[PDB]
Design a protein around this ligand. Structure first.
Ligand code: ZN
Ligand code: ZN
Ligand code: ZN
Lengths: 64, 48, 44, 79, 184, 339, 257, 48, 48, 48, 115
């Protein structure tokens, strides 16, 4: 639903990189370039953001 | 079996009922063992 | 016994005898409010 | 005397003799063998079996209806 | 014994299933007693002959001294005794196994001990054993000149049927027809 | 793209090492990273809803929602009725375990019997929602959702997308797991012996392509009949990122830190947690209730039933010759009776 | 007296990672060091969450799990703090835990991002490392999150949230002189960043008398501790485990005699 | 009817006499344990 | 009440299954003798 | 089938084949680790 | 349902000995050290340090079961040397190495930070 706080493999913090990752993609960055810009070098961390699905955005559409 | 030039000692039928009515209960006992052994050992499987 | 309306989200006090129905909009689906008892979660 | 059955104890006789003797020991029956720090009734029965002290007679029924009574000490234990 | 074997196994297949592994027992004796195959043996050939004769009497499947019991006892252990005699023969005990007197005495004890352990135990539910032994393989058999095989054939044998699925008749030619394709 | 799988995914991309590590992944078993699980790796929620309806039907018989007092109500159980609110309904946010009453239902006796709903014995969750309304029949209707968080355990089923299912055989912490020179540990270790007979080569290609996708930053294309994608092409791409072209890496034993002599095939693979969780299947019986007709142990895990000792087990014990154990199972442990 | 005489060379030291080489050690000591970086270096993390209000789309223990994983500053306060199990107080106190508060209400039409910046600690020494910020939950208009959390001391051997590392790169014998790994085709394998070989040769010549003696580390920090503090904390913690063990061993030896 | 109750796999004889449900039995998933003996079984504490 | 907890010879204590307890452990379908074998119980801390 | 019903399997069988190859050599430390997992070991380290 | 507490792998329950010494009857001058709530961390360094002692004939450790939290260390020494004495010396050597490593790492940090 929401970006995991840590990378599952190594425990690097990735929950502060989703909005930055989205912004970089908005800036015409390629996914590989955006991940590099965020410092995610290990492919375990790149996996976290490259494969994340932000369903919480859909859930916020439903009224509480 | 009665036909000339046909071996009446080794000529055999895979039909168990035919063996029983022609050769007897002991022949079908042996024939039944051989036929059952054939299916078990067909794929190399071994049963005591 | 407070009940939140499933549509208009209005806390309603319903006794064991009176019908279950929103006071304001009349909606028929109610939800119990979160218990005052506080549960402890280990953050694990 | 005049016994035709095997002089060896069968695996099924060993299983029941040990199990039956263990229950007897578990029910405070006197232990025929000297035990040192043994409290499990089933292990005690094993010591008695090895010592050939189990006070049990195996009655082997023959197909004809007759039977042969063998003392557990008489039979040859597998071990 | 050689001629008796030829009747029992006309196909000449010497692979059999017998209680005691004599060749491995001899190998154990050689290692246990440090038999030196190069040196001459101290085992008298007659002790081999007499020792095997005494051993055969100890391996009893049908006890009893009456002629009917004696014949059944002879028949029950016929194959093993032939195998025992052709393995513990004096010629071979001195030529290749080279066992000593002490090793041979131990060998006779092992055959008796292991043979008695092989005897079926009264109370053994051999029928249930046979059903599972012939049923467990069926779980790995396939289903379907061509001849029926596998599970469908197994059914025909146990469901004995007037009309088999694939009746067949193996005919062996007797005279010159066997070796002549034209005459066959 | 047309199955909406991106919008509603059913799995996680896992760093999977195909290695024989400690023997705990043999025979289709899986080693999971305990540290990864501690970070939410394959964490799931189990939601179970209980619906209860109070209906009045009969001359003087009716059902109501209320807390059944042990004295007032006839029927009763050893469960706990303290959680129930005054209206007979448990409240949201309350922890509930096995043998807990979530709905207090009393039916007037022709004083009153107890028909209260007992939470599933195994279930141990938190009341999520308590919905009350009128059902189609106009009767007061309550649905209670109990939320239980399921952390992957030993015995939970996991599958790749290639028919390679397997329960978790053990969970090792990050330091115990084997690591690459970069400090990457596999989230999952599967036995190499699962691949040869099954011939799930697509699993190996997905792992290789997954490695390129994660390094390149592009979602890989695994459409079946596509000549534009080959193993050699994927291997050549992987070389460009400083990895062995065949997806192997030098792994270090986590217990000793020594390099493993064989290089391990490791890379990202999409795995999926299967519905089958061990805690939903574990069942133990020791003198439970018996059924009315046969007076034998009940049937079903949810009914605390006994396991069936069928004809095949009966036939097996006959071959064993265990006559007394056969008598225990079929007489003493099922329905001992006297006439 | 057969102790090693290790030497340390720090190659790179940043705020996130420390890169260093240890020489003249056994492989067991080098491995036990990395293994303590991950599992036995204490830090402070949230381990006790009490949710007063949660109208978000994430259930209560979903939120709590995220709060536990949020790194908190632990550089010097972690040594002062006692383990709550060891502490003689009640459930919690300032000497064994840090109290946290989170009270966010969304009333604007724009989505409200509840981040680690919304976590307020009762002690300035222990705060979320980000204070982009880690996202805890996104709130819709009319949704609120009101909770209080206690952060306590712990290490990664218990839960991964107390693991202070974001990846511990460990390496030795980059040229495979010891042949601890056998390459079927050595030419196919990329050279290590620490490889001292020329481009033409792929493997160093086999060393029959060689032993793992030089070890390369890259200890990346989650943020709770400085990367150099993780290493020092590991070395002192590993020494503490051994010194504690020897005290027990001394009693056992004395007790037997 | 009465006849239906007695015949079949789930009938009285085969379903309740030749085989039946028993007390003191447990069921759960099996996982490998190379550190156990061949004659050992690892058992959960809840079942024990 | 400890008075009722006092044990004397001839009493039976239904104690929990412990390490070394002999159990029969079965996998279905039970096709042959090895489908049901005896095991010594070892208690380990998980649900399988 | 008068033969063992269980043997060595996936990892142990694949590894024992590698282990018993002619060119497998173990250092002093490696050997002492393996003997820790040999319950029947007499405690005497064999001559290399 | 049967999940052990996470702390159970490093905390001793009341009445549990951290380390116990049992003489090995198979061979002389051999003792078995059962250490509770320890894993490959201490088992490997102690074993490797013992192997550096020329008077230690056999040094080895094992985790009998990963789900349990015991390590068994088997030490055999020469007749003139005790396994217990080898064990104590091994720890002191490890402690000296770690303490020296701490000092030299602190110096490295200061040198790197200074310039
Ligand atoms: Zn990562
Ligand atoms: Zn309303
Ligand atoms: Zn305190």
């Amino acid at each position: 639903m929401i970006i995991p706080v840590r990378c599952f493999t190594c425990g690097k913090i990735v929950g502060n990189k989703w909005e930055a990752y989205l912004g970089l993609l908005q800036a015409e960055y390629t996914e590989g370039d955006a991940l590099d810009a965020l410092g995610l070098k290990r492919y375990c961390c790149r996996r976290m953001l490259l494969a994340h699905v932000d369903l919480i955005e859909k859930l916020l559409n439903y009224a509480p | 079996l009665s036909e000339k030039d046909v071996d009446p000692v080794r000529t055999t039928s895979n039909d168990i009922v035919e063996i029983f009515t022609v050769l007897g209960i002991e022949a079908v006992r042996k024939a039944l063992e051989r036929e059952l052994y054939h299916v078990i050992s067909f794929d190399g499987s071994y049963v005591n | 016994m407070i009940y939140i309306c499933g549509e208009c989200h209005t806390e309603n006090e319903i006794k064991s005898r009176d019908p279950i129905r929103c006071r304001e909009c009349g909606y028929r689906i109610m939800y119990k409010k979160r218990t005052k008892r506080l549960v402890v979660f280990d953050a694990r | 005397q005049k016994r035709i059955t095997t002089p060896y104890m069968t695996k099924y006789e060993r299983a029941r003799v040990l199990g039956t003797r263990a229950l007897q020991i578990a029910m405070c029956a006197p232990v025929m063998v000297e035990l040192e720090g043994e409290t499990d009734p089933l292990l005690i029965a094993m010591k008695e079996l090895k010592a050939r002290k189990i006070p049990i007679i195996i009655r082997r029924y023959l197909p004809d209806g007759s039977y042969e009574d063998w003392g557990v000490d008489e039979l040859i234990i597998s071990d | 014994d050689r001629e008796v074997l030829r009747v029992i196994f006309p196909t000449g297949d010497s692979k059999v299933v017998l209680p005691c592994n004599l060749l491995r027992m001899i190998w154990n004796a050689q290692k246990i007693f440090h038999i030196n195959p190069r040196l001459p043996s101290d085992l008298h050939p007659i002790k081999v002959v007499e020792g095997v004769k005494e051993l055969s009497k100890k391996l009893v499947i049908v006890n009893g001294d009456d002629p009917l019991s004696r014949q059944a006892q002879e028949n029950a252990t016929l194959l093993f005794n032939i195998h025992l005699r052709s393995t513990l023969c004096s010629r071979r005990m001195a030529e290749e196994f080279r066992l000593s007197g002490e090793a041979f005495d131990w060998l006779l004890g092992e055959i008796e001990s292991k043979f008695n352990q092989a005897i079926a135990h009264p109370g053994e539910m051999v029928g249930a054993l046979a059903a599972q032994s012939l049923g467990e393989p069926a779980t790995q058999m396939t289903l379907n000149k061509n001849v029926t095989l596998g599970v469908p054939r197994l059914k025909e044998l146990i469901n004995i049927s007037k009309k088999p699925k694939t009746p067949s008749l193996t005919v062996f030619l007797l005279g010159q027809s066997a070796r002549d394709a034209e005459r066959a | 793209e047309y199955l909406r799988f991106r919008e509603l995914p059913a799995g996680i991309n896992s760093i999977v090492a195909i290695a024989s590590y400690t023997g705990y992944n043999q025979e289709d078993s899986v080693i999971m990273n305990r540290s990864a699980v501690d970070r939410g790796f394959f964490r799931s929620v189990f939601y179970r809803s209980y619906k209860e309806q109070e209906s009045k039907k009969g001359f003087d018989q009716e059902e109501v929602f209320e807390k059944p007092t042990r004295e007032t109500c006839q029927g009763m159980r050893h469960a706990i009725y303290d959680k129930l609110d005054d209206d007979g309904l448990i409240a949201p946010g309350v922890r509930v375990s096995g043998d807990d009453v979530i709905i207090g239902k009393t039916v007037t006796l022709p004083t009153k019997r107890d028909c209260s709903t007992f939470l599933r014995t195994s279930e141990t969750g938190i009341v999520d929602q308590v919905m009350v309304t009128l059902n189609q029949e106009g009767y007061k209707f309550c649905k209670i959702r109990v939320r239980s968080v399921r952390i992957p355990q030993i015995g939970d089923k996991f599958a790749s997308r290639h028919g390679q299912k397997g329960t978790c055989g053990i969970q090792y912490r990050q330091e115990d797991m084997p690591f690459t020179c970069e400090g990457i540990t596999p989230d999952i270790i599967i036995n190499p012996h699962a691949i040869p007979s099954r011939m799930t080569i697509g699993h190996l290609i997905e792992c290789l392509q997954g490695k390129v996708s994660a390094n390149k930053g592009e979602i890989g294309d695994a459409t079946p009949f596509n000549d534009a994608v080959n193993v050699q092409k994927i291997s050549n791409l992987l070389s460009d990122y400083g990895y062995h072209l065949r997806g192997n890496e030098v792994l270090y034993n986590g217990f000793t830190g020594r390099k493993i002599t064989s290089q391990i095939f490791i890379g990202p693979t999409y795995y999926q947690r299967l519905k089958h969780m061990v805690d939903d299947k574990i069942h133990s019986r020791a003198r439970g209730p018996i059924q009315i007709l046969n007076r034998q142990p009940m049937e079903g895990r949810s009914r605390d039933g006994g396991l069936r000792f069928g004809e095949m087990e009966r036939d097996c014990q006959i071959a064993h010759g265990a006559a007394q154990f056969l008598r225990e199972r079929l007489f003493e442990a099922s329905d001992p009776y006297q006439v | 007296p057969y102790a090693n005489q290790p030497t340390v060379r720090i190659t790179e030291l940043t705020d996130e990672n420390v890169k260093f080489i240890i020489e003249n050690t056994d492989l067991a000591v080098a491995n036990s060091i990395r293994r303590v970086f991950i599992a036995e270096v204490p830090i402070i993390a949230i381990d006790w969450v009490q949710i007063d209000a949660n109208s978000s789309v994430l259930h209560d223990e979903f939120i709590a799990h995220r709060l536990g994983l949020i790194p908190l500053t632990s550089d010097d306060i972690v040594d002062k703090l006692q383990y709550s199990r060891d502490c003689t107080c009640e459930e919690f106190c300032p000497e064994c835990s840090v109290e946290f508060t989170l009270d966010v209400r969304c009333n604007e039409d724009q989505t409200r991002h509840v981040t680690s910046r919304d976590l307020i600690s009762n002690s300035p020494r222990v705060i979320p490392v980000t204070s982009d910020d880690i996202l805890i939950v996104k709130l819709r208009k009319g949704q609120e999150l009101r909770l209080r959390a206690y952060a306590k001391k712990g290490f990664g051997k218990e839960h991964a949230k107390w693991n202070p590392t974001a990846g511990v790169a460990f390496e030795y014998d980059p040229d495979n002189a010891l042949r601890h790994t056998v390459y079927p085709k050595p030419e196919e394998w990329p050279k290590s960043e620490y490889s001292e070989l020329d481009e033409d040769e792929s493997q160093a010549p086999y060393d029959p008398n060689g032993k793992p003696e030089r070890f390369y580390y890259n200890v990346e920090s989650c943020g709770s501790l400085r990367p150099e503090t993780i290493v020092l904390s590991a070395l002192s913690g590993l020494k503490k485990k051994l010194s504690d063990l020897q005290t027990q061993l001394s009693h056992e030896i004395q007790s037997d005699v | 009817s009465l006849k239906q109750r007695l015949k079949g796999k789930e009938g009285r004889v085969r379903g309740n006499l030749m085989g039946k449900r028993v007390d003191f039995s447990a069921r759960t998933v099996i996982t490998p344990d190379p550190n156990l003996s061949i004659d050992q079984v690892g058992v959960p504490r809840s079942i024990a | 009440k400890p008075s009722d907890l006092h044990l004397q010879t001839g009493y039976k204590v239904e104690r929990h299954m412990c390490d070394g307890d002999i159990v029969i452990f079965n996998r279905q379908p039970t096709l042959h003798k090895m489908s049901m074998m005896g095991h010594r119980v070892r208690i380990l801390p998980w649900s399988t | 089938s008068n033969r063992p019903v269980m043997g060595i399997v996936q990892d142990t069988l694949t590894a024992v084949r590698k282990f018993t190859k002619r060119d497998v050599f173990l250092e002093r430390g490696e050997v002492m680790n393996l003997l820790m997992f040999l319950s029947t070991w007499d405690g005497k380290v064999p001559q290399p | 349902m049967n999940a052990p507490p996470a702390f159970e792998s490093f905390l001793l329950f009341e009445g549990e000995k951290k380390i116990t010494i049992n003489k090995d009857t198979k061979v002389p001058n051999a003792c078995l050290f059962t250490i509770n709530k320890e894993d490959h961390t201490l088992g490997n360094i102690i074993k490797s340090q013992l192997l550096k002692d020329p008077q230690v004939l056999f040094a080895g450790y094992k985790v009998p079961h990963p789900l349990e939290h015991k390590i068994i260390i088997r030490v055999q020494t020469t007749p003139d040397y005790s396994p217990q004495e080898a064990f104590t010396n091994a720890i002191t050597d490890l402690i000296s190495e770690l303490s020296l490593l701490e000092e030299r790492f602190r110096v490295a940090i200061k040198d790197k930070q200074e310039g």
